Symmetry: C4
Subunit: 388 residues, 4 copies
């Protein structure tokens, strides 16, 4: 086994075709399925696996009630081949309430986070053994990606926040070579917040499309130079914008460098990925609520401010339904590195308060240089059927 160095062109995609759905909630009505959220999928040179954080229980468990809350001791990081539901036979690869995973080529690094909010811990596991540990630095919740990290040559990047969701924060980018952090590099850029970065291998570095829970609703970019550790974090030129809540589609703006301050409040985990001066991206159809999922390409959107030349749309999930988080997902072709992407479809309380638990399914789409039809793939489960 030599290393995963990614030297190879990205694919000139033409849109996305469907790859995987698991029906996690549906089956949850007839089987014992874990309680999840904040999923993501990543793969080694052979199989694509699917992760997510549980709630130390199952859905048809009287326990599950109040799964709305993101952190609790009993939450663990699951793993399965891409395609199997999360069952009583799944493994809790580590304790955590946040994470990131990359396959450096040789084996896995699994950053998993847990502790008190104000003082928590981050175990850096690798190849099964626990290679390192680094604790919270601001004293107000150490959180990470909830997406696949990226490694190149033998060094795995991973961005980390601990600060004030809607406020300033310390963003560091740890460079851990084999479960062992070997160098940390402090954030720099126009980016007024970095959180839930969706990172990918666009050689020689790593580029990140994050979230901004404070003033921006136009994703902040985070570019890592795996070559010298230096950082750079701009903002997206695309005038379209994909974050929720967000202004609209006409008064929606972005100048590639400053929080736009338009419902710049919260956010959601999102992705995007360049191609020349263009921009393949995705977001919720609803711009108030996290419902419906569409994906598209903005001409000029990566190199040019306030763009609006949308083209090649797709209604991945219908706007009458509901989605949630999503992240990019790379996966090296036999000549080019193709990007893929996932979408958790969250069914549960706060919204569908018919039941008291919260969990989620997933749908995933990859890159294609061929045709496709049209459609939308939701969780599609009868909340009047589901237990509780």
């Amino acid at each position: 086994v030599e290393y995963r160095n990614w030297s190879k062109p990205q694919c000139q995609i033409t849109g996305f075709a469907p790859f995987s759905k698991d029906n996690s909630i549906r089956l949850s009505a007839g089987g014992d399925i874990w309680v999840t959220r904040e999923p993501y999928v990543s793969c080694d040179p052979v199989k694509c696996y699917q992760f997510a954080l549980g709630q130390g229980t199952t859905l048809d468990n009287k326990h599950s009630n109040d799964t709305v809350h993101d952190r609790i001791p009993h939450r663990t990081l699951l793993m399965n081949e891409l395609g199997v539901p999360f069952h009583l036979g799944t493994r809790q690869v580590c304790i955590a309430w946040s994470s990131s995973s990359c396959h450096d080529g040789k084996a896995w690094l699994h950053v998993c986070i847990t502790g008190d909010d104000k003082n928590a811990t981050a175990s850096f596991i690798y190849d099964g053994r626990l290679v390192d540990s680094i604790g919270s630095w601001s004293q107000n919740i150490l959180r990470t990606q909830e997406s696949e990290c990226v490694c190149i040559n033998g060094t795995c990047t991973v961005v980390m926040t601990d600060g004030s969701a809607s406020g300033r924060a310390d963003t560091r980018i740890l460079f851990i070579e084999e479960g062992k952090i070997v160098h940390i590099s402090p954030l720099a850029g126009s980016a007024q917040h970095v959180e839930e970065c969706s990172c990918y291998p666009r050689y020689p570095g790593v580029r990140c499309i994050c979230r901004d829970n404070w003033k921006g609703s136009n994703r902040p970019v985070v570019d890592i130079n795996m070559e010298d550790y230096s950082i750079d974090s701009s903002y997206v030129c695309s005038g379209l914008v994909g974050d929720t809540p967000r202004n609209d589609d006409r008064s929606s703006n972005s100048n590639c460098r400053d929080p736009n301050n338009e419902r710049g409040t919260q956010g959601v985990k999102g992705w995007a990925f360049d191609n020349g001066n263009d921009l393949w991206m995705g977001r919720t159809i609803s711009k108030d609520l996290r419902s419906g999922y569409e994906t598209f390409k903005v001409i000029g959107g990566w190199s040019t401010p306030n763009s609006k030349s949308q083209i090649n749309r797709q209604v991945i999930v219908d706007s009458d339904n509901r989605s949630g988080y999503s992240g990019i997902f790379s996966v090296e072709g036999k000549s080019c590195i193709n990007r893929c992407f996932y979408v958790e479809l969250i069914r549960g309380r706060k919204q569908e308060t018919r039941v008291w638990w919260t969990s989620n399914s997933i749908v995933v789409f990859c890159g294609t240089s061929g045709t496709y039809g049209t459609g939308s793939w939701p969780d599609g489960a009868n909340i009047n059927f589901m237990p509780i």
Copy 2:
């Protein structure tokens, strides 16, 4: 790993001996089993696996109700070793409501179909990565085999329809070398319809025994020349005939070249496989309803029109019971390539409307050059026991 080139004689079989049953419905009363239909089994140089399309749920799920319908977003392609039931621990290898799978020798290609009926998409997955995509072409349901495709030397064939079930249609035969379609070839032949082809490796090409939902009740043949892409599609000389509904057994006819127009309406997925001028084939015992399964050899039936010299019958499934689809299943011997075949036994609504869900079990029989006894293997599950 060199390639699967099939250069090796087919076996001079003498009838079929039992191989596998899974009891899918029976266990479904005491366990959490997926909701299926349109199964098939295929194997790599080591294990035989069993496929089928689910209904994004399980049987003891209040959801399952109305599984009669063939397409919906939440239907996925399962896979398991030959012998295990479809459980909560099975994987959804792709989203689809149609498919085909072959092992080119090195790894798997998994055509899976999904989208709106009128406009749908076909993901061409291979080795886990998504190599290509080609969308619907007539705008009225892109459908494929629901049986194992066949590869030789490194090129995998797969026939595709999109048109009018009971009407004309476009039938194309895609030649995808490694998840990448590299050449499409348009249908040609006496065949007035091609749909649900049951294809196999009868070197140097590939030969297909399809269905005809319009005017024929005598299977149309579809011969592929993997050598130059050319096509040829005749009809079966056998005067016996195996399709349901169908005329009878005396006024049942076929001339090897034109729809016979005798209850030539619908059909069901069927198989057949030559041997000299003869014909080993199978069909439902009931010629109105898809009930009971028998298999036999018609002397003269492959090279001679309107044949009736039946011999070596078997009551695979009793005519008091019920079957459904079926397809051929090859599996290379240590000197000859033996054919095997499967039979879904569909238990569910429209018929057994005691319950509201529809799923199916399976029985499978291989080729033998030795003796056998007699019997019939049905789903045999108490519909008064089953849930719902």
Copy 3:
């Protein structure tokens, strides 16, 4: 991989120490466990697996009722590593209502039997493919071992009956080299019946301790000469005797050559295995009912008629409980070939008619050249707890 030729001394054992129990019935009250009976365990050069025939269902299935009957279409041959219960995730390796399995070294041969009683079929599977088939020969139930077959050099033996349980019968010994029967050899010996042979590798041939459902209650021996195909079947010299029902322990007799005619009626699957002029054997404590299990060594018992010098007893299962079938189980040491043995503990109807289903657990003991304590390991499950 060279072949399993067994050239290596058997171990001078000193008694049996406990190896495996699975608690099949107990868990059956809190989980979905298959309905079984007629088990046995066998191993390849790495793992020991556990077999048995199911009843196409699970225990907490309303179907299971009337599992007392041995044959029905929906019965299949399971397989799992030695230690896991038979779950909804177990595989039906073949259809059958009888069987035998050996690992010739390279891979598995799985004789499985099914068909009408009067006319049935026997599929000879191997390495996943179906290599051969041979049908019933007397027209009254083709049955086999229900124990591990034995292979040496590359030829696998397997004894087969079809005749009259309590009457004469045809006993043949098929020699199948790679799923392909290559020579059948007709039974010869003092043995007035051969049925449920418990066979083992006592180089250069294979020796069998069977059952006799007609006139004997003293196990008939069946010695195979894998060298020239010739057969020889004596009877056990041991005057102790181990079969149920059986006379007693004082008027119990055997002369090494003729059915003794003492409650010589039915039987049960049993084992035994020589050592010099002695005899390590096992049987039920109850000599009317199949309850309790003990094992011991009779000095002189293999080379001398009507023996009674019992020594080294063990109460494997207490006589207040209940057992059933049992068979020998070899397993090559790092210098000597050690024998092991299993014991199904049948819980169910006809006896414990509190419930209407019948299934069974298992306990297994191997050979030891070291000390041991005392005890008894029953199914030990509350029939008042169990479902139905």
Copy 4:
């Protein structure tokens, strides 16, 4: 595969970071989970597995009632990768009511104990085959570690008691090279009792931190010389002390050589592990009841009597909750051998007599040379939710 010889420095740890929790009880409310207790985890050069002894059943089984009792025929030794719950798909690797497991490098040795209390047996399994057996020697319960044994060069140590819990006893240290005991060595030392030793590879020998159910509440040390078989068993210099029940924290004492006689009665399985003249150890927060878990380092505590210079505490499990047993768990780093440790959290009768069954979850922590936060990880399951 060469052998596991451990020549390599232990790691200068700085405290413990979280690795694994499984939520065994929580899921037990929504799934079929085995009934356990007396767990432990151990690993081969690749995966870390988790063991424990069951109670031949599952929790939602009416059987489980009265799982308070430690021994019964139907108790078996489970095994799974580190992270999966104990499910109906787990294997019973042997019958036992006590055990120990080490990976000599090449494969596993699994001492499992069962029999009458007064006369029991100990099967010494290895690589799947049963290599040896040695029976009880005092006639009053042969018990072993309930923790991972340690092998070096090719010889696996394992300490064994059989005597009087609160009285004298015979303590032997068997040296079994490949499932075959090749030399037994009798205990020697100041140690007035050895029971439930928590052993580890501190090259060239093996050192053990046991329990004392008679007069001590200050762990007895047990040092093995794998070099010449000689033994040595002192007591811990640490004046802090970690055993429950125990005096307090001020009148708590130890002189490194004699039972201190302060609530020196019972105990619990514990661990500890040196580092220079210091001592990293752990115990229950409650000194009467086995509740809460903390871990720390006592300066001077390994080489100096009655120590009280505690530092680097952690509240692993909060004192408002409840723990149970615990043991050390080694795991070779890429330059140093890191120690890890587990903690069963027992939920069940005698205490939480709301229900009638007893089982347990687990939390596990490894060694780190990096920072960490703070927190506590309990079973945290609603006893008012749980079944029974």
